[PDB]
Design a protein around this nucleic acid. Structure first.
Ligand SMILES: Nc1nc2c(ncn2[C@@H]2O[C@H](COP(=O)(O)OP(=O)(O)O)[C@@H](O)[C@H]2O)c(=O)[nH]1
Ligand SMILES: [Ca+2]
Ligand SMILES: [Ca+2]
Ligand SMILES: [Ca+2]
Ligand SMILES: [Ca+2]
Ligand SMILES: [Ca+2]
Ligand SMILES: [Ca+2]
Ligand SMILES: [Ca+2]
Ligand SMILES: [Ca+2]
Ligand SMILES: [Ca+2]
Length: 903
DNA sequence: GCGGAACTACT
DNA sequence: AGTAGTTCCGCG
């Protein structure tokens, strides 16, 4: 079909691009690309080229890129603007693919790899690569195979080959539980020497050069390690062969006692999945280990193996290798579920950029606006720098800490991109300034109307209402494109059902899969043929209908992610269209809006319930307001409600038929007041929360800004079977807290909201004793010792020493003169427990090796002096009180039943 | 490292 | 205790 690119690169004066041919073959190309730039000219030399300001420009075509750059520097001294796209890779993509790109991921080579490197001393530093690579599994998507390169005769031991027959059996037999559907997709290659092994790994890499490279943290470890290693042994010029163009660029970094290398390989796109998972996940994981995330996303357990990690190879090789493969596999399962690489390509090919530039909102948007502008003979402004300096932020109401029974919230749609469209804020729409009053004067409609000819903002800017802005025109385009892909998706997910129903009655015969476009609901003619098709054809059509559905879905998650990252570009000094005054016009507007709708709602609810000065808005998000329906319920006794599911119904209607309308009216009166281009502030109710009918629960509470808990029944229309707990900033998932205390802290919240003060106390008492009876290692902690030697002063903790190092020294002191005891080594991993004051160890804590169990040398004292109380009060009662105090409760009664017996 | 949450440590 | 100063994630 139409060809698409794989990678674009600027190597001096030529562009090096890898692409897919019109006949589907992968091809490479070199092009001494000849760029163009622009310069302003007089109103008599004008042609067809204009900047966003309307002033004419003349084109300048250079012989090569070096000249073009050279001409920009030169143009700088003269003091004249150099308009035009200065990143020549994007201009070349815009010229070579002047049409919507339609790609076929099935022709794109995506590589996923992980390596293993045995280390006696500390964690192997990549920038040094002193330790040999004894394993390396490479999964190629084109071939759908797991290529395992297993070493066999290292300076750290020699071993037996891996056995696939074993690998698939139950561990309870010696097997490694390697998934079934993976066993036949493995190609095991055993080697007798590293240098050998390594060379083969390169022939492999040239014969199957990745286009996209993934793994779990391959960017800050695996890649630099493989690079430096090969370098060390064969030379940087036979290491640069990991680059299809023999060009690399090594960047170095280091802070105090940490240092790293990130080797950018020319001609190949690196999308580290961890880096990727942290961006599109939108879920803060308290940890990002392959192990933790794999559990979260796959409810799969941390593969077991005993002994210290640094010797798992000479100890047990079989399992050593099997856990290398499993891990590469766990990463595919996460992608097969999150589909993040697939989202990368889509967004990448949409903006026409290098796929990795997806991590940068600046590049992506810069390309979109450029391409949009170029198709109109428009010339982009030259990027000039400006001093970084903050401006007002998001208004966040300081809530009065307390309990809140009935609460329903309202959110306004895509607030910021929406302001940019309402006020018409863009760099070339600025039209003036006005004498500005205090912000309070504006939220209260006390100040004078700024203008009757221009669109304004509370900060003092005015914009042109007669012309569309470059930025706002672009936002609207992307917004309308989502609606388009929604439809395609729904129609494909709909044509999908039709096809399945057909499959219930396959026609015994031989036919073909119909030639139809799945983005559109099938015609009656098609539907009628479906019923007669065979099972082969039909099953095919289901694939293709299913393919089309996912495609339209990713397309819209894309336009959605895009729109949300725009404000991030417009506020960044390095964005080509940045302007401090505009960035501030958006932020000051958003503030005013929120506090204006606040006054209005407080106005409308006090009138409707017949009262005065009452405050119904208890808290304000940056784009949300939380209202307490307390009186709105008291207005109806709360004894006239059948079940709880009844009042949820009632409030649901009271917000749609009365709340919403009074809100829309208010946002329009503000649109005129500020005289804006188009009214776009849409604030719809989203959540309904409170305590189960006829219960003692409190409903919810706020401790402070961004810290609250709500018992939610309905969210934007969908009624929950079981109420859901919404927890924000109460830190109930600290990595520092024992898993059992995380579950207990969440339990006290549910009981406070759904059951009540009484029910709370009962439970605090319960967890109290059950916690004091937990195994030690249960409540222990982990961290590693990677700078103990320094912190060590004559055997004791030196100044500013870290807790775990204190333990690693305390342990270190009780083991002097013993050889059976597991020693702690620089870089290893350890366990830490707080010791009770007065212990035989002489310090407040102690640590020990995580790879083996506590020496019988100290075990008994450790168990006897473990400081349960300090942990219990530090991780469970200190935070618990924050909730209770603010909510006006007590997790323990001071006076109980016994003080009736006059003992 | 990055960027930074997220932990000590001090006037 | 706010405000200021450190560790350090993820990788064997
Ligand atoms: N319009 C436009 N072109 C740019 C800018 N920067 C570099 N160019 C280059 O301008 C040329 C585009 O002109 P083109 O559309 O082919 O002109 P025409 O087709 O002869 O009218 C290409 O070499 C672009 O890469 C820019 O900011 N705006
Ligand atoms: Ca790894
Ligand atoms: Ca590993
Ligand atoms: Ca990284
Ligand atoms: Ca049939
Ligand atoms: Ca919100
Ligand atoms: Ca208006
Ligand atoms: Ca909504
Ligand atoms: Ca101190
Ligand atoms: Ca220091």
């Amino acid at each position: 079909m139409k060809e698409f690119y794989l990678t674009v690169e600027q190597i001096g004066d030529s562009i090096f691009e890898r692409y897919i041919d019109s006949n589907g073959r992968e091809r490479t190309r070199e092009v001494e690309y000849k760029p163009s730039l622009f310069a302003h000219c007089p109103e008599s030399q004008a042609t067809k080229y204009f900047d966003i300001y309307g002033k004419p420009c003349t084109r300048k075509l250079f012989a090569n890129m070096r000249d073009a750059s050279q001409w920009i520097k030169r143009m700088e001294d003269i003091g004249l603007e150099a308009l035009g796209m200065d990143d020549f890779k994007l201009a070349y993509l815009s010229d070579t693919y002047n049409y919507e790109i339609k790609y076929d991921h099935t022709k794109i080579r995506v590589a996923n790899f992980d390596i293993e490197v045995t280390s006696p001393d500390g964690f192997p530093e990549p920038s040094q690569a002193k330790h040999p690579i004894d394993a390396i599994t490479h999964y190629d998507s084109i071939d759908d195979r797991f290529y395992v390169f297993d070493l066999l005769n290292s300076p750290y031991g020699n071993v037996e080959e891996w056995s696939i027959e074993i690998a698939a059996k139950l561990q309870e037999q010696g097997g490694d539980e390697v998934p079934s559907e993976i066993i036949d997709k493995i190609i095991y290659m055993p080697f007798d020497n590293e240098k050998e092994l390594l060379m083969e790994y390169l022939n492999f890499w040239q014969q199957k050069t990745p286009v996209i490279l993934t793994g779990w943290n391959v960017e800050s470890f695996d890649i630099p390690y493989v690079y430096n290693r090969i370098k060390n042994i064969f030379g940087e010029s036979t290491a640069k062969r990991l680059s299809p163009h023999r060009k690399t660029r090594v960047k170095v970094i280091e802070n105090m006692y940490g240092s790293r290398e990130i080797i950018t390989l020319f001609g190949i796109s690196v999308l580290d999945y961890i880096d990727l998972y942290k961006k599109f996940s939108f879920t803060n994981q308290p940890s990002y280990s392959l192990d933790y995330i794999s559990e979260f996303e796959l409810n799969v357990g941390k593969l077991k193996y005993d002994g210290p990690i640094s010797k798992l190879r000479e100890s047990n090789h079989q399992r050593y290798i099997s856990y290398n493969i499993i891990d590469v596999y766990r990463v595919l399962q996460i992608d097969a579920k999150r589909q993040f690489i697939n989202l990368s390509l889509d967004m990448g090919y949409y903006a026409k950029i290098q796929i990795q530039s997806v991590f940068s909102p600046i590049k992506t948007w810069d390309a979109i606006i450029f391409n949009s502008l170029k198709e109109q003979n428009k010339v982009i402004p030259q990027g000039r720098s400006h001093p970084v300096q903050p401006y007002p932020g998001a208004f966040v109401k300081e809530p009065i800490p307390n309990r809140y029974k009935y609460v329903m919230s309202f959110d306004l749609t895509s607030l910021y991109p929406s302001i940019i469209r309402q006020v018409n804020i863009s760099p070339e729409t600025i039209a003036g300034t006005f004498k500005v009053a205090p912000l309070h004067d504006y939220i209260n409609a006390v100040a004078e109307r700024p203008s009757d000819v221009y669109s304004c903002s509370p900060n003092g800017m005015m914009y042109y209402k007669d012309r569309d802005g470059v930025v706002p025109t672009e936002i609207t385009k992307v917004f309308n494109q989502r609606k388009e892909h929604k439809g395609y998706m729904l129609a494909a997910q709909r044509n999908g059902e039709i096809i399945k129903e057909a499959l219930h009655n396959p026609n015994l015969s031989v036919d073909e899969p119909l030639d139809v476009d799945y983005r559109f609901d099938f015609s009656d003619e098609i539907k009628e043929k479906i019923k007669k098709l065979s099972a082969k054809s039909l099953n095919e059509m289901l694939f293709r209908a299913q393919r089309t559905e996912v495609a339209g879905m990713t397309a819209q998650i894309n336009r959605k992610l895009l729109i949300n990252s725009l404000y991030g570009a417009l506020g960044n000094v390095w964005f080509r269209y940045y302007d401090l005054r505009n960035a501030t016009a958006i932020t000051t507007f958003g503030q005013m809006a929120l506090q204006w709708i606040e006054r209005k709602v407080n106005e409308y609810l006090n009138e409707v319930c017949g009262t005065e000065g009452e405050a119904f808005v208890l808290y304000g998000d940056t784009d949300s307001i939380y209202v307490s329906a307390d009186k709105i319920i008291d207005k109806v006794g709360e004894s006239k409600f059948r079940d709880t599911n009844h009042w949820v119904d009632f409030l649901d209607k009271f917000a749609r038929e009365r709340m919403e309308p009074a809100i829309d009216r208010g946002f329009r009166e503000m649109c005129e007041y500020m005289n804006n281009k188009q009214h776009l502030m849409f604030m719809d109710r989203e959540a309904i929360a409170g305590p189960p009918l006829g219960s003692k629960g409190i409903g919810g509470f706020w401790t402070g800004k961004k810290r609250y808990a709500l018992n939610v029944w309905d969210m934007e229309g969908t009624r929950y079977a079981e109420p859901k707990l919404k927890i924000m900033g109460l830190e109930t998932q600290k990595s520092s807290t024992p898993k059992a205390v995380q579950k207990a802290l969440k339990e006290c919240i549910r009981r406070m909201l759904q059951e009540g003060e009484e029910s709370l106390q009962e439970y605090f008492k319960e967890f109290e004793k059950e916690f004091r009876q937990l195994n030690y290692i249960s409540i222990a902690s982990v961290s590693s010792a990677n700078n103990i030697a320094k912190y060590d002063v004559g055997g004791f903790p030196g100044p500013k020493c870290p807790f775990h190092i204190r333990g690693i020294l305390t342990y270190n002191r009780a083991i002097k003169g013993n050889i059976d005891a597991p020693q702690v080594v620089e870089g290893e991993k350890v366990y830490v427990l707080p010791l009770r004051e007065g212990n035989p160890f002489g310090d407040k804590c102690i640590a020990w090796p995580s790879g083996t169990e506590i020496t019988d040398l100290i075990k008994d004292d450790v168990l006897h002096w473990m400081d349960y109380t300090v942990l219990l009060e530090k991780t469970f009662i200190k935070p618990l009180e924050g909730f209770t105090s603010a909510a006006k409760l007590d997790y323990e009664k001071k006076a109980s039943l016994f003080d009736m017996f006059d003992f």
